[PDB]
Amino acid sequence: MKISVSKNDLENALRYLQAFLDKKDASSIASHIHLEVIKEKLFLKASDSDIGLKSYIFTQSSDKEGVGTINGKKFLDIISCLKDSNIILETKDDSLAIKQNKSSFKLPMFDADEFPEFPVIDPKVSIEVNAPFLVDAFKKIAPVIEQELAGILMQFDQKHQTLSVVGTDTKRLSYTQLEKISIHSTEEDISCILPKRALLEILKLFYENFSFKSDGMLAVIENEMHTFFTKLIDGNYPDYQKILPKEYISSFTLGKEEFKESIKLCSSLSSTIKLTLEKNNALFESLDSEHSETAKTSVEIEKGLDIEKAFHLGVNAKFFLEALNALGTTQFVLRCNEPSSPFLIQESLDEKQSHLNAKISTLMMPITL
Amino acid sequence: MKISVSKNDLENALRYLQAFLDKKDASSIASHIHLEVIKEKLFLKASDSDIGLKSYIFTQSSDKEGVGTINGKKFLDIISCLKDSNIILETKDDSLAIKQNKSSFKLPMFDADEFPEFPVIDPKVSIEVNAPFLVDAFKKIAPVIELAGILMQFDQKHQTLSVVGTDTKRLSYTQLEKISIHSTEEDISCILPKRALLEILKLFYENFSFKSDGMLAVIENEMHTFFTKLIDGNYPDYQKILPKEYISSFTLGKEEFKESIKLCSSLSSTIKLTLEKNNALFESLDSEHSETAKTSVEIEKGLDIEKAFHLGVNAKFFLEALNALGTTQFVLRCNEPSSPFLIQESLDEKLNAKISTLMMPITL
Ligand SMILES: O=C1Nc2ccc(Cl)cc2C1=O
């Protein structure tokens, strides 16, 4: 192998690969990046049986094609320290030479045959995502997922052209339903579970104009510059639809940002808050605070709510905050039944259709008293 | 007690006090700040045997004077979540109420009598510092740190304050001149602990005073008084270590040298410098088998060398010695490759401090 490349492109490509390397054992091939020059491109790839990324960059020149490997951290450490000029990369037997002008590096390669093979799939399901809504869905739901519940659910119904995205731990549950989606599939209904680990990586890599394919065991995401894959978590996600209350007794439209501030404020002294809703006021009190410690605040509700009898509700503070951080609206709807039954946080006008973005609703279990 | 205060002012004061609290045990007074309203001021104080800080802010209203205590962390957590509005602080039993419009809080106070008294000194030495040179010296020497502190040695005769830090493999020092030292002995030496040095960097820039009996340092500006205990006796004479003369002295590019070193130190802790008439060459030294990093830069202004001077140097030490300099060039003063060498500013013989560093080389 012998080529010259741009430093900015090489660097950028290297930063994204870092997260796919087991960097601690530098004597394992799991710490190395796989290189290959075909035609006027350098392909860079880091992977294991479980997750992977393949990228490419273009060459200024390409005297000689071939394969190689290199420690990912070192290679990035060296490249990030260089000037903004061409880097000559060039194999010397079992070593990779890097060169830029007066600077000269040699690094040992491993056997490129040991590098795990980058899988190809026969998709059962495939979509083209040409807007931010899916990654918007991932980003807003991720916080509820603890690393089958250890992942995000993507549920495809071809019949109805809907993709459902759902996360949960024991205590809360966020979902969204992306309607009007061009689902190409070999069944009418199929469910993939992406690990949290992969979810996070997807957020760093993709936004819109990518394809998502799966064969029911691996997912492969792809755009012009990248191909990423992950193993799926085998199993059955619980039926989320079963858990949702059928109807809600009460439905309150409230100030997102006033509620965040008042919650953050009480939660300075507690993990849980007592919410009191009245006609024209909301009251927040610290709940599980120590003997002798107390926080209280309130906000005016100018457009009166429909109650006579004042509604009280114990909530976990962080959950409630995170449910409000998943909404794009200035106001939110709180839907409840009994103070000890689950309640729901969702956007103002959540039934309305959105082009660019996902609308996440969160169902939460309250705290007693 | 009972008062109102500006939120920003209070927040600011609480932030500086955080470092003087043991926060892990909320049930100990060490997690608390001492409060006191006298006149139109609120005094806040966090201290122990070892170190302490006392601050004040002005009150917007006063009403009842007295004293109190409060958990510092919880106080800062509460305050930083309020509007910019004025805040009422009012005792109420053995509890402090905090109030801002619709928001109100209560926190338990402890007995203000268990709080250690803030010490006063009969000063053996004292100086007024109306320029940033001292803190500049402190920031520059801190990275290299009896020898667990920074030395301040006052020579009343010569009107000089020497600041010295070392870890046995390198030594950094400055001698600050033309300093109006007031003391009652001839040559006094205070050793400040690292913890104290760090806190000082956060509090003081210029227009403060520094005073010490031979046991505590107290430092004081318009908003604050800080103290720390000194480290007890016998800082080695750094002057004993300095070479008398140096064989070679080379003026060299600081930034070219940093880059070339960072770059080589990607594969090792140590580097082989080679100097020639018109080039400097850098090579990773203790890199693992078959890893290699070389680079070089041109020296347009020829160095006085017949044949190549080789010197093994510790990459991070050499970097921090260059980071401690304020000039675009630096001077490297050398004897034999096996004996210590000196890094200092170009035009070091002369607002700021100029720190020189002496380092032990690496063999082969
Ligand atoms: O997120 C949730 N997980 C649950 C499991 C059982 C019941 Cl009854 C409610 C919930 C939630 O809100």
Author numbering:
A (entry chain B): 1 to 147, 153 to 374
B (entry chain A): 1 to 145, 153 to 357, 361 to 374
Excerpt from the publication:
Among them one such target is β-clamp. β-clamp, a part of DNA pol III holoenzyme is very crucial protein as it is involved in myriads of steps during DNA replication. It is the key protein that increases the processivity of many important enzymes and complexes by interacting with them. β-clamp prevents the polymerase from dissociating, while polymerase’s rapid movement along the DNA molecule. Biological active form of β-clamp is dimer and each monomeric unit consists of three domains, where the protein-binding site resides in between domain II and III. This interaction site is divided into two subsites and all β-clamp interacting partners bind to these subsites.
All of these crystals yielded clear electron density for the ligand molecules with good occupancy, except for 5-chloroisatin. The occupancy of 5-chloroisatin was quite low. Moreover, based on data obtained from the soaked crystals, the temperature factor of this inhibitor was high when compared to the average temperature factor of the protein. Thr175 of Hpβ-clamp was also observed to make a hydrogen bond with the inhibitor 5-chloroisatin. In case of 5-chloroisatin, the Thr175 of Hpβ-clamp makes hydrogen bond with ligand however that in Ecβ-clamp is made by Thr172 in the neighborhood. Out of various hydrophobic contacts between the β-clamp and inhibitor, three of them are common in both H. pylori and E. coli β-clamp. These residues include Ile248, Lys176, Arg177 in Hpβ-clamp, and Val247, His175, Arg176 in Ecβ-clamp. The orientation of the 5-chloroisatin inhibitor in the docked structure did differ from that in the crystal structure, but this difference did not affect much the structure of the binding site. With an MIC of 18 µM drug C1 (5-chloroisatin) showed significant antimicrobial activity. The drug C1 (5-chloroisatin) showed extra H-bond with Thr173 compared to other complex structures may be responsible for better binding and thus better inhibition.
